[PDB]
Paper text:
Svi3-3 represents the first structure of a phage-encoded SAM degrading enzyme. Svi3-3 forms a trimer of ferredoxin-like fold alpha–beta sandwiches, where each subunit has two helices on the outside and a five-stranded anti-parallel beta sheet at the center. The subunits pack in a triangular manner, forming continuous beta sheets with their neighbors and are each in a ‘velcro-like’ topology where residues 2–6 at the N terminus of one subunit form beta-sheet interactions with residues 120–124 in β8 of another subunit. Prompted by DFT calculations producing high energy barriers for a hydrolysis reaction within the active site of Svi3-3, the TLC assays and NMR show unambiguously that Svi3-3 is a SAM lyase forming homoserine lactone and MTA.
The structure of Svi3-3 in apo state is overall very similar to the complex structures (RMSD of 0.84 Å over 124 Cα atoms), but there is a shift of the N terminus, a conformational change of residues 7–9 to form a more extensive interaction with β9 and the preceding loop of the neighboring subunit, leading to a slight loosening of the trimer. In addition, residues 64 and 65 in the β5–β6 hairpin are disordered. Small angle X-ray scattering (SAXS) data confirmed that Svi3-3 has a similar trimeric structure in apo state as in the presence of SAM, indicating that product release and substrate binding do not require trimer dissociation. Svi3-3 forms a trimer in solution both in the absence and in the presence of substrate. Comparison of the average root mean square fluctuation (RMSF) of the protein backbone shows that Svi3-3 is more flexible throughout the 100 ns MD simulation in apo state (RMSF for trimer 0.91 Å2) than with SAM in the active site (RMSF for trimer 0.86 Å2). Interestingly, the residues surrounding the active site cavity, and in particular the methionine-stabilizing residues 104–106, become significantly more flexible in the apo simulations. Thus, 100 ns of MD simulation demonstrated that apo Svi3-3 shows the highest flexibility in the regions surrounding the active site, and that these regions become significantly more rigid upon substrate binding.
Numbering used by the authors:
A (entry chain AA), B (entry chain AA), C (entry chain AA): 1 to 59, 64 to 129
The structure:
Amino acid sequence: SLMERLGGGGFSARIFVGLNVGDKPTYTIEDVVKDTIAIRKRQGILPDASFVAQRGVYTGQLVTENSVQIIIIDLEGLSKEDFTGKVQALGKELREDFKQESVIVEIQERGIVQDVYSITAEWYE
Amino acid sequence: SLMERLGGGGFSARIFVGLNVGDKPTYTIEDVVKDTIAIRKRQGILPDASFVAQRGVYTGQLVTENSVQIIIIDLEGLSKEDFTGKVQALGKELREDFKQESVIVEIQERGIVQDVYSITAEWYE
Amino acid sequence: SLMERLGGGGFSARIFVGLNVGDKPTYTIEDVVKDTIAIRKRQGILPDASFVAQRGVYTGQLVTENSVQIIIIDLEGLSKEDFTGKVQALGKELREDFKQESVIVEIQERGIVQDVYSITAEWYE
């Protein structure tokens, strides 16, 4: 076994996606992973990512929903803003593909949070 | 979709709660989430939080238990010590509500760990 | 309940292990936890660790696999390199015990990533 130190950290991102339309359980974690590979394939990047399941509670009223935590590592060796741009594009497309009111995107470097973007739908009301 | 940068990080906390009394599986993750909303409701804060399931191994002997990872974000915009105080209150009440011998509380800012508090029961022996 | 501040963080590590041989689902999360206690028992360290389940997607072709996230805390109070050495030994042995092509090892301190080691099999080809 060859042990190689890839570095001190690098850029990573985390995307949180709910599975409810309003308050109805609708999508599964398998829906989000299959749709995440498809989006990043069209981006040209390697769609390599991992997914963690979560239980969520949020508020207007209080809903309990299942959510999915998406972890992306900057494997293709991009700059921070080319990497941030595609993650934000993935989050924006993920919010539409699952009719979410909001999607959180959090960019990290060596585990330290650099930015946390809010992707909110502008539904007319 | 409106993309707004909420900031560079903020304060967050993580609470780890076991599900065993001594060595007997007793509680589920649904027990911890329902009891976590109830506590933070009485605190006045928005009870918004997410929950991740875990498998645990700890030591006196070695027990394997299911545990729950609770993630709290400082959404209400508190100072670090008003936020830390309520998390520590939530952890202290969670340890009693599930008869835990110990509960770990870890405060973060932008993902960097600031403090890790130990909440241990003082059972007479 | 006695609340004691253990410190500002400490050393922690994360080990990611897949469950597929090539592309066939083979092992479960229970296989990895039982084998992780056994290895760290032989290391002399307290085998205390937690385990999180994951869904994985990686690329040569694209495979979808279940994986396990192993979280280790420096409870025994070692130096960074005695702690790093045993984690790397655990990762190296874990890669063999489950016939993995690669295993990622990531050392943290107070949540900040210090090193990310790659443990790759040198299969002759």
